[PDB]
Design a protein around this nucleic acid. Structure first.
Ligand SMILES: [Mg+2]
Ligand SMILES: [Zn+2]
Lengths: 70, 137, 145, 199, 143, 63, 49, 67, 100
RNA sequence: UAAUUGCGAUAACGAACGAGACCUUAACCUACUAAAUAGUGGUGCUAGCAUUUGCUGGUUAUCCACUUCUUAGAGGGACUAUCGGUUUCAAGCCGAUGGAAGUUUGAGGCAAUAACAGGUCUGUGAUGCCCUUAGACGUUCUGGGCCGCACGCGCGCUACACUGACGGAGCCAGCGAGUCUAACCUUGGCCGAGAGGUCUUGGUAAUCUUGUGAAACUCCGUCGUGCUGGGGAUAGAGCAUUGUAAUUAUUGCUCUUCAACGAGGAAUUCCUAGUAAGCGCAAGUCAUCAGCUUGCGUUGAUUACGUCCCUGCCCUUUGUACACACC
């Protein structure tokens, strides 16, 4: 609750212009790059896995491996 | 014809018969062994010599006795030994040796069952060698 | 999962049934902060009230809160089994209750005070501050302060 | 190329494994060369493996540990903490996820990345408690680099959001690149700090 | 083209059979959902109340189709795992008998499973039919 | 950073109070015609190659 | 003169020494743990491992 | 260790003292002859005797041995 | 004629085989038909106990065993070749139960 | 060398006890033997799926043949085999090949002359002496105590969490035990949420529990890093079981407050490969009760292959006014 609890929409352009400067994307990577809290990521990454820039590497659970669009 | 394979206490009995590429493991196919990480440990004695390499044989294995990993190693040894025996008997021993060379040069107990059996535990401590904690004072 | 922008329709730590509730936690385990409801009781009542347990109190509702509270206050009438209640056959009426207030402490101290007024061994032990459920006192729970 | 199939339905993504230049199930193996000359004979690529779970004898003799796949040795080092004793399937899934993360970030042949990490984190001089500045065998270099990498991963992933797979990932990546921001390289440089002061 | 329960092993089979019990509309639920933990040695009920009984039905059906007659004690010992008994070492605890008994009775009423001449429950003819239906549907759906 | 590495050709014996260190007669890889004696902690055999930053420092027995 | 002693350690005794402690109630021995150690070979019980 | 005791070594020497125009330097055709010319009461001890006799007669072709 | 099953059980393997081999030749000398002698697995009756008759010393445990062995042979013969054959196996130490 | 194991040096030579050898068990044997109390195929009995006949299948009195897996008898097999390096001259050691097994092949049982004022008279209808013996220190009955709590110590169980908790899902062992004067192991139905109750059934046993459908573990989801949904100490209420008798809660089950614990100071224990550790199961103690022990298997590492820095022990030397032998 210390940071990025439920909304993170005052800077809602950073759900779009976030891919550059890091090629990786993960549940930990999102909470690491000072943007979002891990209380929503497991379903927030699903939006972009279904339609977006991130391609899954495997069928991982309890983990995340996504790569940028080539 | 029939072979067996063991790792610690599991035994996997394989029947190799003339047929059309049917590889059953528990009634399910070899693709559904479900260690989910040792699923490529059961493809070793096939991928090794030739990736497909075989539409003439049918391997029906049934494994009972150990644990998940022990039974996966048991089936991966049983299919290997079944292939070796079938080639030795029916196809030719030249080719059985030519695939035994690959099996032994990748040996992961495929042809020879591992000898490591559970060493008996001795009184005065959990485990065979580990002893209970002692206090002097 | 969906649009949760909700510029002014978010709720911070909030007010419910004598206890402040952290609206940043899923409703069941957040509500477990009320003294008298735990994990399973909160899960049962919140899946009876047909509220979504996958959300936090900051967005859930403003009336389902008091609805769930009333379900807690009248558990046996809203089709909840009797064995699911923490206080059954209370001491003098046979009914089955569930204390959810700054009242479980008062009911416990009332049980203790009657157990001391009766001059029972359990009451005497609670008076002396020692363990009461047949524990061994020779080695454990020495300082307790 | 060579789309041979048979009665048991398995996609030919695995039937294309060895007909060409051999690789892992996901990563090229022939692009593996150590950045040094001394840690050979103790790092054991080639033979290659399909999964780092070769449950074979490696502790009966003295110098047979060196002929164990380095990826499985790294898994065996994660095979630690007591809580994660056993759980070899857990540790091998962790290594698979870590190798995938290296594939994704600074791809650089992830297996080459981890072996380069080991080589760059192998302590070349230590101190014996007599503190005498003794030298370090290549085998001790290799397994102590593996231990340092794994324990840095462990106490990085402990009590924080990122999981053991990604902590192991960035630890190895930093060790391969040779930066002093990770735990393993800092500890190796600490061990080599007493190299001139105890000769 | 020759599909059985043993062509999809463990999870993609549920991923279609549970949806099949959803579509069937017959709930077969006795109302204990949201009230039971499904095992005496558990600490919580299933997270999602809707779906766990359908997955129990699918699993019981597949479990008695892969083998011969199966009894209530068998399913109890199977589905019941370890228990956090406190400051004591964990220990295998059997599962809740009532839920397995009622899922067996539900499969009875729906005709997926029948009685056996020696005791216990054996998969019925329409049970094998239905299980092969889900198997062959899943195989062509997602290999 | 000066560059030099060597290879143990003759392992002499154990050294150290507890028996952890081993003496090795090393043949240098560059300037091969030179046998220098060194001390090493880990297990070493013949035909093994060591990295030693300092090139000329005869490490002796550790009493 | 005597209350029921049909269960518990008081119900059984060593068939030889009648000691109520250490009793070997296995395979139908009903012998003391020391009296059995003494007369073990004579029953057919021996040491091999 | 793999050191042989006196009841191995002395019996082997006694066999080689009187059976040199006899069993060759091969263990398989050594133990067989031991079976019929020695009252060994255990196959493990027989194997020990025959192996040490094989070693003795293998090194006999490199110079005479003491005793 | 009557069909019977003989069960042979003992601790003494030597005399257990002394009867399991005597019975086969005593049925061959009358040229009967019989299912082969089946050897049920030996029950190892391992029993741990304390060497100490008291509670002093190093904790040292000692196990005992009475390994029990048992076999079974089925055949059919007339009543005289049943009784005169069950009167052959009286080897002291091997117990014989003949069921019909 | 594990060894007074051997080589060898040599007023010794030849030996004996111990060690070893031996026995038990654990590894192997497409070799012999024999098996609906073990298992496998093929004929009918067949329900699905596909239909050119095949996948999974049940067919516990339904057909034949067999012994690869299982079992247990007799045997076989390893003796560091062979080849190299090092061996003073050998004993041996070290590599590689092959081998099922190459560290005494792994683990045990047995364990010389002996010494302890080590423990046990509370195991004995073993027993000297002393004491007690009719208000008994004998035996028996009721009740309480052994468990009691300013505190110190040891053996342990559970944790501090994301390599994790929680839920569904996969469904993977071995060692055993289990009742005829009778209530033991319990399969299968119905009820309850659960412990548990209930109507039965099989098992005196490779036959039934039991395929002990064990646990850890594996898959997918909930949790999001919080003294938190980690941890379950403490206490409250209710239901059963065991027992003549649960109060000082035997135990199990349901709900509830949810303590310390942020990985541990000085110190300190165990251990070298199926071993440490993690995991549970069986048996013993049992009318009931494990956090205990004895065995067992599932998962399976790290480091080492050395040494006398510490401790312990042995041998040798050495001093003695000791010989009841430093009490
Ligand atoms: Mg006491
Ligand atoms: Zn006795």
């Amino acid at each position: 609750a210390q940071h990025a609890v439920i909304l993170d929409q005052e800077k809602y352009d950073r759900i779009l212009k976030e891919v550059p400067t890091y090629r990786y994307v993960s549940v930990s990577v999102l909470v690491d790059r000072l943007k979002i809290g891990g209380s929503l990521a497991r379903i927030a990454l699903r939006h972009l896995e279904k339609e977006g820039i991130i391609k899954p590497i495997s069928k991982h659970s309890k983990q995340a491996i996504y790569t940028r669009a080539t | 014809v029939q072979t067996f394979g063991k790792k610690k206490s599991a035994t996997a009995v394989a029947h190799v018969k003339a047929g059309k590429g049917l590889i059953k493991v528990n009634g399910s196919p070899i693709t559904l062994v479900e260690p989910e990480i040792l699923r490529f440990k059961v493809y070793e004695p096939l991928l090794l010599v030739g990736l497909d390499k075989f539409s003439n044989i049918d391997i029906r294995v049934r494994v009972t006795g150990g644990g998940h990993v022990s039974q996966v190693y048991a089936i991966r040894q049983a299919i290997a030994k079944g292939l070796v025996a079938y080639h030795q008997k029916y196809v030719d021993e030249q080719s059985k040796n030519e695939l035994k060379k690959a099996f032994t040069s990748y040996d992961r107990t495929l042809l020879i069952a591992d000898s490591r059996r559970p060493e008996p535990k001795k009184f005065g401590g959990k485990g065979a060698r580990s002893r209970f904690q002692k206090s002097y004072r | 999962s969906l649009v949760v922008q909700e510029q002014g329709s978010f709720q911070h730590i909030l007010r419910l049934l004598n206890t402040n509730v952290d609206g940043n936690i899923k409703i069941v385990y957040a509500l477990t902060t009320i003294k008298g409801v735990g994990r399973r009781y909160s899960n049962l009542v919140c899946k009876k009230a047909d509220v979504d347990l996958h959300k936090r109190a900051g967005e859930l509702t403003q009336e389902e809160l008091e609805r769930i509270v009333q379900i807690m206050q009248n558990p046996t009438h809203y089709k909840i089994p009797a064995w699911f209640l923490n206080r059954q056959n209370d001491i003098t009426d046979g009914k089955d209750y569930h204390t959810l207030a700054n009242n479980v402490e008062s009911k416990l101290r009332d049980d203790l005070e009657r157990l001391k007024k009766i001059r029972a061994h359990r009451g005497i032990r609670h008076f002396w501050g020692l363990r009461v459920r047949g524990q061994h006192t020779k080695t454990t729970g020495r300082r307790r302060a | 190329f060579t789309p041979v199939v048979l009665a048991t339905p398995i996609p030919e993504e695995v039937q294309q494994a060895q007909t060409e230049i051999k690789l892992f199930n996901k990563w090229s193996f022939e692009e593996v060369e150590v950045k040094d000359a001394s840690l050979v004979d103790y790092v054991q690529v080639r033979q290659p493996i399909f999964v780092a779970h070769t449950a074979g004898r490696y502790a009966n003799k003295r110098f047979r540990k060196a002929q164990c796949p380095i990826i499985e040795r790294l898994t065996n080092s994660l095979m630690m903490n007591g809580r994660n004793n056993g759980k070899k399937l857990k540790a091998v899934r962790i290594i698979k996820h870590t190798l995938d993360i290296i594939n994704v970030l600074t791809d650089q042949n992830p297996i080459q990345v981890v072996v380069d990490a080991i080589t760059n984190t192998g302590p070349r001089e230590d101190t014996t408690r007599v503190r005498q500045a003794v030298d370090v065998s290549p085998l001790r270099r290799v397994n102590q680099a593996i231990a340092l990498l794994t324990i840095g991963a462990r106490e990085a992933a402990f009590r924080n959001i990122k999981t053991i797979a990604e902590t192991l990932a960035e630890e190895l990546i930093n060790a391969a690149k040779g930066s002093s921001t990770s735990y393993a390289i800092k500890k190796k440089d600490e061990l080599e700090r007493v190299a001139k002061s105890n000769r | 083209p020759g599909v059985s329960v043993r062509d999809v092993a463990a999870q993609d089979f549920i991923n279609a059979y549970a949806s099949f019990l959803q579509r069937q509309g017959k709930l077969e639920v006795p109302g204990y959902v949201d009230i039971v933990k499904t095992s005496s040695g558990n600490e919580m009920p299933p997270q999602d109340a809707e779906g766990w009984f359908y997955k129990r039905a699918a699993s019981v059906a597949r479990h008695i189709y892969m083998r011969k007659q199966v009894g209530v004690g068998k399913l109890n010992k199977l589905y019941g795992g370890a228990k956090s008994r406190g400051v004591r070492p964990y220990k295998h605890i059997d599962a809740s008998g009532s839920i397995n008994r009622k899922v067996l009775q539900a499969l009875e009423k729906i005709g997926i499973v029948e009685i056996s001449p020696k005791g216990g429950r054996r998969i019925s003819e329409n049970g094998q039919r239905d299980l092969d239906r889900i198997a062959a549907q899943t195989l062509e759906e997602d290999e | 950073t000066p560059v030099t590495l060597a290879k143990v050709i003759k392992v002499l014996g154990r050294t150290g109070s507890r028996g952890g260190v081993t003496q090795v007669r090393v043949e240098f890889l560059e300037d091969t015609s030179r046998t220098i004696v060194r001390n090493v902690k880990g297990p070493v055999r013949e035909n093994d190659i060591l990295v030693l930053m300092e090139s000329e420092r005869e490490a002796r027995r550790l009493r | 003169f005597s209350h029921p002693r049909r269960y518990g350690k008081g119900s059984r005794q060593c068939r030889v020494c009648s000691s109520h402690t250490g009793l070997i109630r296995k395979y139908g021995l009903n012998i003391c743990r020391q009296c059995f150690r003494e007369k073990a070979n004579d029953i057919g019980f021996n040491k091999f491992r | 260790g793999r050191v042989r005791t006196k009841t191995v070594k002395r019996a082997s020497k006694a066999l080689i003292e009187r059976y040199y125009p006899k069993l060759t330097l091969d263990f398989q055709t050594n133990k067989r002859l031991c079976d019929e010319i020695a009252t060994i009461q255990s196959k493990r001890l027989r194997n020990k005797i025959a192996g040490y006799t094989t070693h003795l007669m293998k090194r006999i072709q490199k110079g005479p041995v003491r005793g | 004629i009557i069909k019977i099953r003989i069960t042979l059980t003992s601790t003494k393997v030597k005399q257990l085989e002394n009867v399991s081999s005597n019975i086969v030749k005593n049925a061959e000398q009358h040229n009967l038909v019989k299912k082969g002698p089946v050897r049920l697995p030996t029950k190892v009756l391992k029993i741990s106990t304390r060497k100490t008759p008291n509670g002093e010393g190093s904790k040292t445990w000692e196990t005992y065993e009475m390994r029990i062995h048992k076999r079974y042979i089925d055949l059919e013969a007339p009543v005289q070749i049943v009784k005169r054959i069950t009167q052959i196996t009286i080897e002291p130490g091997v117990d014989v139960e003949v069921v019909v």
